[PDB]
Amino acid sequence: ARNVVYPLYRLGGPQLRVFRTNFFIQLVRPGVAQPEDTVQFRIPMEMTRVDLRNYLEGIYNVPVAAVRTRVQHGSNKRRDHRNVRIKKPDYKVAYVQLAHGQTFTFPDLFP
Amino acid sequence: IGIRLTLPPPKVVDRWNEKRAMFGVYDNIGILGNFEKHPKELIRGPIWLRGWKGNELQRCIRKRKMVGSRMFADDLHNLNKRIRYLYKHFNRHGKFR
Amino acid sequence: ADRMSKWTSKRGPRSFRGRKGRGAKGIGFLTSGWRFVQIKEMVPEFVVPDLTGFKLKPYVSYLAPESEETPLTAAQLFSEAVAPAIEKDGFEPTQEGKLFQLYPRNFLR
Amino acid sequence: GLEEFFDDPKNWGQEKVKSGAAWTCQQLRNKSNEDLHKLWYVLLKERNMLLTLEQEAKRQRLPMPSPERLDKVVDSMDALDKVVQEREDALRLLQTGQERARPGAWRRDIFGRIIWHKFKQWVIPWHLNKRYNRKRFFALPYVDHFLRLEREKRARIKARKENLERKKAKILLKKF
Amino acid sequence: KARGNEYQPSNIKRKNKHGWVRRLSTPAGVQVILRRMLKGRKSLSH
Amino acid sequence: LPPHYRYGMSPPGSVADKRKNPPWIRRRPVVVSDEDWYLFCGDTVEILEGKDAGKQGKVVQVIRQRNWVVVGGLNTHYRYIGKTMDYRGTMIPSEAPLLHRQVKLVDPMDRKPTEIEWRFTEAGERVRVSTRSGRIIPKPETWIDGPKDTSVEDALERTYVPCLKTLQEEVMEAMGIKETRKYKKVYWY
Amino acid sequence: VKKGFRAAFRFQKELERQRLLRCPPP
Amino acid sequence: LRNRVTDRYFRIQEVLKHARHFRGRKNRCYRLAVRTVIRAF
RNA sequence: CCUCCGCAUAAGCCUGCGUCAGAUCACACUGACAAUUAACAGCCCAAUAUCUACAAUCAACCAACAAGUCAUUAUUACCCUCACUGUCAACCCAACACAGGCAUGCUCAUAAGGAAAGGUUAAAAAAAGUAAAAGGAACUCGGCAAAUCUUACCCC
RNA sequence: GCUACCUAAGAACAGCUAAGAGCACACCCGUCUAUGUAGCAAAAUAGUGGGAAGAUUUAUAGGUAGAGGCGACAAACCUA
RNA sequence: GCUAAACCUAGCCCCAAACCCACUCCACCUUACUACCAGCAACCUUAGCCAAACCAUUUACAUAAAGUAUAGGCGAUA
Ligand SMILES: [Mg+2]
Ligand SMILES: [Mg+2]
Ligand SMILES: [Mg+2]
Ligand SMILES: [Mg+2]
Ligand SMILES: [Mg+2]
Ligand SMILES: [Mg+2]
Ligand SMILES: [Mg+2]
Ligand SMILES: [Mg+2]
Ligand SMILES: [Mg+2]
Ligand SMILES: [Mg+2]
Ligand SMILES: [Mg+2]
Ligand SMILES: [Mg+2]
Ligand SMILES: [Mg+2]
Ligand SMILES: [Mg+2]
Ligand SMILES: [Mg+2]
């Protein structure tokens, strides 16, 4: 979860268990002709790679195998009538690779 | 071009206000209220020049001792600077000495 | 020389870029060879239920009536801690032996 | 599978999807903590459905099919995250009696103002800390002049704001 | 020689000199931040 | 919206608003109050002064921010819509807005413009009643569900038996999750 | 805007003088 | 500005109307119109 | 036809000639959309003891002085595993699309990278060159500059 | 963050001849000249030159501050 | 007839009166905006321009008594 405080674990405390997950992702069309088996999300900025792996297998039951992350800088050079900058919000990008050759391709919304 | 094209909206003035028609009422409360109050005890203004005419330098000195204990910090500093300037102007500059 | 820009991880030199990071809430620690040790216990696992046989959907229908609010005060919920508390004529002293402590809030969300 | 990021493909490109009546916070109060927990993971499954679509609406330069149901669902979780937070803040008062689930204290910073300094959950006592003992929560009385100057800057802005509205009300009474 | 390029930038040297830790380190420097929050600056430091 | 915004006939987020109101205009504001406001949306009224006087009409849009009513198809002027090319486009008689107190609410049976007071009847409670007569003036003015709607029968299930046991723990007691380890204490400062 | 009235008025009796020398009446 | 001059136009035009038949910038510019209409009188 | 550059890294800046659209010397500007994926590089170490005289230089002869850039052990403690961050560009510092400034590694003529000429005419003056009869410092403050390469001596 | 010096830990120095040696690149400096003088440039360009295994150059972080710093004294330099 | 000209109203000043202000969530003295590991700590006469036609002592920081008593290179002035 995000905008919360995590309990601090010393050595033999319980497993940290999350009910009512705060962070919401979104699935996008890749823009650069991604491989087959590679499916691309938009992670919100406070979410770990393994925190996405367990999030898909937990809820959406997707057998994910390899995850890569990168942080995309939002462009800041957007000026106003007040000549002050407007920052488009920087985001995190997943590259989820599916196991078992599950072979997903992005569908055509808006036919 | 400083002159304006449309002539301004007419200033409608009510000469018979509650304030205009009864202006000066309870002046001469001293001479014919058998001197219970003074006409200077009805001027509603600032607390330092309440019935006292004075000068400019005399106004800034009187403001500084009557009010300057409870003035804002820079407004006091712009008051000490102005007494210091008017002291150097009235006493040391000008014609007629 | 830019002051009003946000200081993110992308800005400094090599020593600076690797340190800061985004709001990660990291998991493990670093030992002696820059060898990361991912603790399984500090990884948040999700408690997701099952959803089959479940009657609720993300929207309700408009034919459901309008009703007025009731901010559930602590006074209101004591009036349902009364069902054994009228027969005597539920409380925990500390939270040291509890696993979900309330005031030193042990849990998450 | 991944198909539950998407709605039913009989609704693809339909420019109108009939989905209304967001979860009003009274109706969530009646349900149990079991079912509110299961309701959260259904709105999660459908908010994630809608955020793909609006990111794909923006990609193919089209309007959203029905933007009016995105804000139905986000305030439904907010009502759900309000009702659950009532029940903990209900019985945290019963079992402890003390608000602010995060402990904190009113601490005066360097700059003389007081803040609500929230606490940060450490494994050592506060007298052994390298970093926390480098932090300073006190006055150092050179600040006391700059406290007064900001106290007058706040008071002057407040005095300006109170005096516009009396001038604005008079020009309203000079017209009506 | 030519005489304009007198800001050879780096970010270690900028924040060690004009950082927020350096401003709060010396009691003289704390007054700098106060004169900037009084004026109401957007960036009180680097 | 900017402070000192000028409330137009077009809605405050329309494209046809932002053509008129970019975020940098600071035109001088208008003068206007008293939320007890008898002119609601859909009432039948008449028009006192100005052109098209005395006629009756329903109000379509009411704008409280500038004390306006837009009566139905009346006090209109004629404008071109579309036009798209070097040709005309069709015409609409487009309603100009009507400022409040130029418009009086009309009697339901007597069909006369009367001032209205909000009297508290005993029957409950605060309804619009006329001046010259009595005759309280009311407030004038199928869904079958899809797959993502719940029902009416389930949204009031009243599942909550209100126990003292902290949702994060009752999910854990009901999903078969066992935790041997206890929480070691922490110095919160 | 300047605060006057008389200066603006005399400009009105000067502009309307120019009208009747630019486009005179029949 | 309390008490700023409103009728500056009619002080310029009483000078300029005696300088309309001049040459150069003297028939328009008031700085140059005065120094010639004084010498014209 | 030039290549006195180029390609990476470091530093720096922070999306700044990718796609679609658009307004409006010549058609990097504006709006929307897209990307840069770690394995290389960052981000490191359980204590308390206790050890470390013999340069580097092809390290061998030799030869030094200015005397030098790299090492553990003993016991206790220990078995969770591959998270986070940087990754774009024609770029940075010089008010600029500035002949300037800018560390290293490879390339030492280039497999990278580029264009001195908007078009014309072919006046002066000016500039950058090249060629010169005969003479060869006569010029000039002075062989300055250019072209050729060299002799001897003073002053400090 | 320029520069004066210093500290820490780094880097660079082809080729040829035989050591604060010689010729000579990279690199550093800036002798004399011509252009430039609101310039390409708030000190540059083109040649020409001095040094180029060291009292050399240089990247990085740190230190010393104005009644003062620092200085192979030019009263130099310390953000034109 | 192009350039342009004009416009009231944002707001503000001055007083009166009244003593002003701080926790949505998370983040912030480390390189602030950074979830998480074992030593220090605040209190020190303002000076100077200026006036003295230089300058060296000195030079202001309710009403009424009163610019009085006093002070002062007995002087500027206080
Ligand atoms: Mg690259
Ligand atoms: Mg320059
Ligand atoms: Mg090429
Ligand atoms: Mg030409
Ligand atoms: Mg010849
Ligand atoms: Mg001669
Ligand atoms: Mg001669
Ligand atoms: Mg020569
Ligand atoms: Mg040598
Ligand atoms: Mg040599
Ligand atoms: Mg030196
Ligand atoms: Mg000397
Ligand atoms: Mg000298
Ligand atoms: Mg003097
Ligand atoms: Mg003198």
Side-chain angles (χ1 to χ4, degrees), chain B residues 51-83:
Chain B
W52 174 93
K53 184 173 174 65
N55 205 2
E56 184 181 355
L57 179 138
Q58 294 178 356
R59 264 183 283 112
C60 296
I61 295 170
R62 183 170 174 88
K63 184 177 180 180
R64 196 251 297 280
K65 66 182 181 180
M66 282 184 88
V67 158
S69 56
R70 42 157 192 151
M71 274 182 87
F72 280 10
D74 55 345
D75 273 359
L76 191 154
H77 189 212
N78 294 307
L79 191 68
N80 287 329
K81 279 208 293 191
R82 180 66 181 271
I83 306 182

Side-chain angles (χ1 to χ4, degrees), chain B residues 72, chain D residues 151-167:
Chain B
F72 280 10
Chain D
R151 198 202 173 279
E152 294 161 13
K153 181 204 188 101
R154 254 201 311 290
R156 202 191 319 254
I157 297 169
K158 177 183 249 174
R160 281 190 260 134
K161 182 181 177 293
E162 294 293 328
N163 204 39
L164 290 175
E165 316 163 324
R166 202 185 267 91
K167 300 262 176 307

Side-chain angles (χ1 to χ4, degrees), chain A residues 76-92:
Chain A
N76 198 24
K77 55 172 299 289
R78 264 271 310 290
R79 302 268 200 175
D80 298 350
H81 52 95
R82 299 292 183 184
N83 215 29
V84 68
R85 298 176 183 269
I86 286 307
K87 185 158 222 151
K88 281 194 277 191
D90 62 358
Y91 46 85
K92 212 166 187 150

Side-chain angles (χ1 to χ4, degrees), chain B residues 10-24:
Chain B
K11 316 171 285 188
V12 297
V13 58
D14 184 36
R15 296 253 182 235
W16 299 99
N17 274 357
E18 203 272 333
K19 205 172 201 253
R20 271 196 188 81
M22 302 266 267
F23 174 72

Side-chain angles (χ1 to χ4, degrees), chain C residues 47-98:
Chain C
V47 184
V48 56
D50 62 357
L51 281 174
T52 303
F54 182 60
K55 294 312 201 243
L56 298 155
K57 323 280 191 50
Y59 306 99
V60 307
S61 46
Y62 283 118
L63 295 174
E66 313 291 329
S67 177
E68 190 273 330
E69 42 275 29
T70 312
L72 192 173
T73 42
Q76 194 302 339
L77 172 153
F78 173 66
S79 76
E80 279 82 11
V82 69
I86 208 73
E87 271 146 29
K88 279 162 191 170
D89 203 3
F91 175 80
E92 281 304 9
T94 69
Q95 285 88 3
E96 261 296 280
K98 216 180 168 188

Side-chain angles (χ1 to χ4, degrees), chain A residues 33-93:
Chain A
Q34 218 62 42
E36 196 60 49
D37 186 74
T38 300
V39 57
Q40 178 166 0
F41 291 94
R42 275 188 174 187
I43 308 174
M45 272 275 288
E46 301 86 330
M47 182 177 176
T48 308
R49 160 172 319 192
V50 297
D51 209 358
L52 172 84
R53 184 176 177 87
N54 301 320
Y55 180 84
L56 300 182
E57 307 164 296
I59 304 174
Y60 285 78
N61 274 327
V62 187
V64 301
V67 176
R68 274 87 40 80
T69 43
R70 66 150 177 106
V71 186
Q72 176 57 50
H73 171 74
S75 87
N76 198 24
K77 55 172 299 289
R78 264 271 310 290
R79 302 268 200 175
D80 298 350
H81 52 95
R82 299 292 183 184
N83 215 29
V84 68
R85 298 176 183 269
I86 286 307
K87 185 158 222 151
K88 281 194 277 191
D90 62 358
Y91 46 85
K92 212 166 187 150
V93 170

